Write a protein that binds this DNA or RNA. Structure first.
Ligand SMILES: [Mg+2]
Ligand SMILES: [Mg+2]
Ligand SMILES: [Mg+2]
Ligand SMILES: [Mg+2]
Ligand SMILES: [Mg+2]
Ligand SMILES: [Mg+2]
Ligand SMILES: [Mg+2]
Ligand SMILES: [Mg+2]
Ligand SMILES: [Mg+2]
Ligand SMILES: [Mg+2]
Ligand SMILES: [Mg+2]
Ligand SMILES: [Mg+2]
Ligand SMILES: [Mg+2]
Ligand SMILES: [Mg+2]
Ligand SMILES: [Mg+2]
Ligand SMILES: [Mg+2]
Ligand SMILES: [Mg+2]
Ligand SMILES: [Mg+2]
Ligand SMILES: [Mg+2]
Ligand SMILES: [Mg+2]
Ligand SMILES: [Mg+2]
Ligand SMILES: [Mg+2]
Ligand SMILES: [Mg+2]
Ligand SMILES: [Mg+2]
Ligand SMILES: [Mg+2]
Ligand SMILES: [Mg+2]
Ligand SMILES: [Mg+2]
Ligand SMILES: [Mg+2]
Ligand SMILES: [Mg+2]
Ligand SMILES: [Mg+2]
Ligand SMILES: [Mg+2]
Ligand SMILES: [Mg+2]
Ligand SMILES: [Mg+2]
Ligand SMILES: [Mg+2]
Ligand SMILES: [Mg+2]
Ligand SMILES: [Mg+2]
Ligand SMILES: [Mg+2]
Ligand SMILES: [Zn+2]
Ligand SMILES: [Zn+2]
Lengths: 91, 97, 127, 214, 201, 97, 25
RNA sequence: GGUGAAAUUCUUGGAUUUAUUGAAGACUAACUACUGCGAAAGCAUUUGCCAAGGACGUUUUCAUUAAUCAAGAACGAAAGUUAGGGGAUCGAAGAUGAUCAGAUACCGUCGUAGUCUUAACCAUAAACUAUGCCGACUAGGGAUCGGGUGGUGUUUUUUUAAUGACCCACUCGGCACCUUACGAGAAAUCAAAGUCUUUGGGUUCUGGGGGGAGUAUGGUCGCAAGGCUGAAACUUAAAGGAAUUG
């Protein structure tokens, strides 16, 4: 029963603010509201509550993350660069 | 593969899925092998590993989350520990495992 | 027998360099180029100027301590012409005929595993 | 009103051991004054000389060698392994049309812990009686050949440092064992180690360094 | 009023039977229950705190001290981090690149924490309406909203006054200006739309 | 009409190759369509050989020439190197000389 | 005039009638 | 330094040259060819992993399941747009040095965007073989790529082999060239552009003198630039093709 050709959650903002500005918000709200896969128990029960604070429905783990998505791109690359460099200490 | 073996065990042998039942197996000495999820927490791990060594049961740590171990045994839910009770035509007991 | 150094001749078009250095390189010994021995810009790379410059080079060469030298000829290279300049041979000719010694020489032009877009534009230099 | 030559401290370059003439070259420094002496400053230079220029025999016209200066003593400074190149003219010859090229390389550690990466280039050969004009491998050939070369190169190193690794390259033992395992797969010609560079020397260890000296 | 989450990290007390709790700025990926290691001879994983000495170059580090033992100072805002780019073993320094891009050299005894700070991208979302700005500063300080000096009277501002709204004189103001003079672009060495790429060389 | 069965130059079963730059004017030009001259010539020259080996160490030495591949762009290949222009018949002849 | 430039010619010309017509939307 | 020649430019800040190191982004030289692969766009460093494909082999299996296709859909160079990153190189814009009568250019310098990547758009190229697909038939030749068959063939040594590469004959399926021209064409040319007034294998698409014009208008798609669809009034006797001689 498709409700909006294109505004999705951004439809709350009515005609205000100008399309381009609403677009940007729509991207980050779709991000910041979705349920995410939990690393520790594999259930898709991680949700946000306050920027950078993602925690788990069941299992009750809280992981410090990005402001509107659990893993920021840059920290992810940082991860593997700590991966990489640490390897040079045992081997 | 390791999953190719499990797929045989699945269609010709006996197995139980999940934590509590495989402890009924580990104590009964019925378990011939237990497969452990990557992300299943260390406490449960360490326990299963202690119950195992108390029954001389070998332990194969699956390098996959409890979700993919669920497709490994071909069940549409997740599983964080399998217990081999009978290995059918497969050889998992007497190969690399 | 002789005391050895390293010659190194960069003969592009529009100029020609000759400067012997210590066989390690880190220490020079006298430069002088084909530009210095003439003034016409247009004439900064002709073999005559390269000769006179090889002269002025060999002179201090045999006047400091180096009696012999290995040479390393070299074009502009990079993404450039990769072909030697006119006054490269004229300088080699003018330093063996000078009276110094010659010992085993190779070409050290920087040739790439090609890239960095050559200049000039896709339509080339059209004139 | 200076002329740095009328001031230049002078010096001569000594070579290592497993070759021919331990006397190599000449250099220029600057007098060892208090604050900036001739010693600790430079020395540690690098001079490249064709090994036929230091082995005498011309069956080594290519194969340039890079030496690096480490220690100094009374107008006499030694030098140790720092690299091995190839002449440009040689490869620029070698690589002829109508045939296949094959390159391979690997990074490896030795005994006395120098970490280095060596190379290895080799070209297919026409076999005597061929009528077709080109003679190329079969890709699947080149994968086998690289893997073998790689297996052989990883073996010939981690032996007794460069010293013995150098003692292996000088008579090109590697080139011939490559040739041996290779001929089962595909002809090939030339076949050299071409390049080998340093990238992780261990530590000074002056006692071990002096092992090529007498 | 902080962009990035904090993280309470409990420790034992070496000298008395008790727990002592600290308040860290949570680096990204840090999770409740995780163990955090803090010391010279500690390993190189996100969340641990290690002196700038003990990390190879390219390590990425947050909340790093200026002086050893000032308990953190650089890169603390949601998303920032410092990169180590080199060490001086004799005179034990380390050289780092701060979030601004300035390169600074500090003692290697100065400590940082492995990773970046949580809450990245907080600024990518448009505030979108006055009220969200309003609430933003409600929890910060009384700096909102702002009136343009060019809407004031000359009594109120250097920009104040005129029958049209205009600065009247250059809005670049000397470093040696005086309180009451410095409104505009203080000590600006250039001005106008930054054309081309920025980025320190 | 068409004045070359090989079109610009030689390519059948590709549709796209890869441009190379012209050693003269730096013009991009597809590799198959290039025109290429192997420039192998002595480091020295005609006259320098005697005075070379004269003022030279070693028995006659060895002498190592320089090899470098050249690339021209038709226009630059016409302006100098391999061209003339040939009769309508003399065109089809791929005999090197 | 070159066909491509004559293409850009009317390419513009249209884009300006585009403007002009919107004056009366 | 740079050019036909020069100038703008760089140089106690020792430039250019040199040596030793390090950093970044791009790229894949030679090998590279009338050679490969892919529906096309397109695709050359190593290796590992992931799925895929043609040809061949086939005394396997199925048994008409197929050919070609309005609508509809997947992919689609380069530039261009949105949001991050990246931003070494080269470099639309712009500013300059010269040149010129002029010179908004050509050449030189600085160099914004771009060039690279990720998530999205855009859907066009002389996107070319300017040449629809499936099927049959019609003519000689030497090369070559992949598969296969035949050999008391060569070279590899060991103890003969086995292998591997190589040689010769054959046959499939390729990318091509050569000579022919029974035949075709207006010709250039063409093993199809042939088997066509002795006019019919199946099927898709397009064109109907030149301009006007891919313009106007509507519909549709796009953020935009634009894409698809797409007339008419009027004007005009030529426009055009291939070849010949000058
Ligand atoms: Mg409804
Ligand atoms: Mg011209
Ligand atoms: Mg094979
Ligand atoms: Mg903060
Ligand atoms: Mg404030
Ligand atoms: Mg207020
Ligand atoms: Mg205001
Ligand atoms: Mg304001
Ligand atoms: Mg007022
Ligand atoms: Mg006032
Ligand atoms: Mg004022
Ligand atoms: Mg005012
Ligand atoms: Mg105003
Ligand atoms: Mg082409
Ligand atoms: Mg194409
Ligand atoms: Mg209006
Ligand atoms: Mg290559
Ligand atoms: Mg319809
Ligand atoms: Mg594109
Ligand atoms: Mg750029
Ligand atoms: Mg301009
Ligand atoms: Mg002008
Ligand atoms: Mg202009
Ligand atoms: Mg210009
Ligand atoms: Mg089209
Ligand atoms: Mg074409
Ligand atoms: Mg077409
Ligand atoms: Mg035929
Ligand atoms: Mg056979
Ligand atoms: Mg015919
Ligand atoms: Mg005819
Ligand atoms: Mg008509
Ligand atoms: Mg309309
Ligand atoms: Mg948009
Ligand atoms: Mg439209
Ligand atoms: Mg149309
Ligand atoms: Mg229209
Ligand atoms: Zn959970
Ligand atoms: Zn050209």
């Amino acid at each position: 029963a498709k409700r909006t050709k294109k505004v999705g959650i951004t439809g709350k903002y009515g005609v205000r603010y100008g399309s381009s500005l609403r677009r940007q918000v729509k991207k980050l709200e779709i991000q910041q509201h979705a349920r995410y896969d939990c690393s520790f128990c594999g259930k898709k029960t991680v949700k946000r509550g306050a920027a950078g604070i993602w925690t788990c429905s069941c299992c009750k783990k809280t992981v410090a993350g990005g402001a509107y998505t659990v893993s920021t791109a840059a920290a992810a690359t940082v991860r593997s660069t700590i991966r990489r460099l640490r390897e040079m200490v045992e081997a | 593969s390791i999953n190719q073996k499990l797929a045989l065990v699945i269609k010709s042998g006996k197995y139980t899925l999940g934590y509590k039942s495989t402890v009924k197996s580990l104590r009964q000495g019925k378990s011939k092998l237990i497969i452990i999820a990557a992300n299943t927490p260390v406490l449960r791990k360490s326990e299963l590993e202690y119950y195992a060594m108390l029954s001389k049961t070998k332990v194969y740590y699956f390098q996959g989350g409890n979700n993919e171990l669920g497709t490994a045994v071909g069940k549409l839910f997740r599983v964080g520990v399998v217990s081999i009770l009978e290995a059918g035509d497969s050889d998992i007991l007497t190969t690399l495992a | 027998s002789q005391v050895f150094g390293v010659a190194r001749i960069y003969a592009s078009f529009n100029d020609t360099f000759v400067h012997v250095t210590d066989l390690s390189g880190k220490e020079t010994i006298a430069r002088v180029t084909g530009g210095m021995k003439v003034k016409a810009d247009r004439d900064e790379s002709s073999p005559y100027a390269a000769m006179l410059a090889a002269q002025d080079v060999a002179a201090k060469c045999k006047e400091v301590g180096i009696t012999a030298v290995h040479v390393k000829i070299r074009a502009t290279g990079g993404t450039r012409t990769k072909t030697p300049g006119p006054g490269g041979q004229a300088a080699l000719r003018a330093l063996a005929r000078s009276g110094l010694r010659i010992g085993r020489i190779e070409d050290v032009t920087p040739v790439p595993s090609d890239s960095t877009r050559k200049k000039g534009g896709r339509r080339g230099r059209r004139l | 009103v200076v002329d740095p030559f009328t001031r230049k401290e002078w010096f001569d370059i000594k070579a290592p051991s497993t070759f021919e003439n331990r006397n190599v070259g000449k250099t220029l420094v600057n007098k060892s004054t208090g604050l900036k002496s001739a010693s600790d400053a430079l020395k540690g230079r690098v001079v490249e000389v064709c090994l036929a220029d230091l082995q005498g025999s011309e069956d080594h016209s290519f194969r340039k060698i890079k030496l690096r200066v480490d220690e100094v003593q009374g107008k006499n400074l030694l030098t140790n392994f720092h690299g091995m190149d190839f002449t440009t003219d040689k490869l620029r010859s070698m690589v002829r049309k109508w045939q296949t090229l094959i390159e391979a390389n690997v990074t490896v550690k030795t005994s006395d812990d120098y970490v280095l990466r060596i190379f290895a280039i080799a070209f297919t050969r026409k076999q005597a009686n061929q009528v077709k004009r080109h003679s190329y491998a079969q890709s699947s050939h080149i994968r086998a050949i690289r893997k073998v070369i790689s297996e052989i190169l990883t073996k010939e190193v981690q032996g007794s440092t460069l010293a013995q690794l150098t003692s292996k390259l000088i008579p090109e033992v590697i080139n011939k064992e490559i040739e041996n395992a290779t001929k089962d797969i595909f002809p090939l010609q030339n076949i050299h180690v071409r390049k080998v560079k340093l990238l992780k020397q261990p530590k000074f260890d002056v006692g071990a360094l002096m092992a090529l000296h007498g | 009023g902080r962009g990035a989450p904090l993280a309470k990290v409990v420790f034992r007390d070496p000298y008395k039977y008790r727990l002592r709790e600290e308040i860290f700025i949570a680096n990204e990926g840090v999770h409740t229950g995780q163990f955090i290691y803090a010391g010279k001879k500690a390993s190189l994983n996100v969340g641990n705190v290690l002196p700038l000495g003990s990390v190879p170059e390219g390590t990425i580090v947050s909340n790093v001290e200026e002086k050893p033992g000032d308990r953190g100072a650089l890169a603390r805002a949601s998303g920032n981090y410092v990169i180590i780019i080199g060490h001086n073993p004799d005179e034990n320094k380390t050289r780092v690149r701060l979030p601004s891009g300035a390169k600074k050299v500090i003692s290697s005894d100065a400590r940082g924490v492995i990773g970046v700070i949580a809450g990245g991208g907080r600024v990518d979302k448009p505030l979108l309406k006055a009220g969200r700005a309003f609430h933003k500063y409600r929890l910060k300080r009384n700096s909102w909203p702002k009136t343009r000096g060019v809407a004031m009277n000359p009594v109120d501002h250097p920009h104040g006054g005129g029958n049209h709204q205009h600065i009247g004189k250059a809005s670049t103001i000397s470093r040696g200006a005086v309180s009451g003079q410095k409104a505009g672009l203080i000590a600006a060495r250039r001005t106008g739309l930054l054309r081309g790429s920025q980025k320190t060389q | 009409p068409k004045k070359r069965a090989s079109n610009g130059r030689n390519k059948k079963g590709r549709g796209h190759v890869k441009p190379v730059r012209c050693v003269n004017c730096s013009k991009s030009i597809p590799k198959d369509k290039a025109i290429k001259r192997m420039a192998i010539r002595n480091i020295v020259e005609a006259a320098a050989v005697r005075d070379l080996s004269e003022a030279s160490v070693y028995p006659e030495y060895a002498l190592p020439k320089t090899y470098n591949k050249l690339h021209y762009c038709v226009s630059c290949a016409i302006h100098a190197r391999i061209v003339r222009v040939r009769s309508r018949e003399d065109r089809k002849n791929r005999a090197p000389p | 005039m070159r066909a491509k430039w004559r293409k850009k010619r009317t390419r513009r010309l249209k884009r300006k009638r585009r403007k002009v017509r919107a004056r009366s939307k």
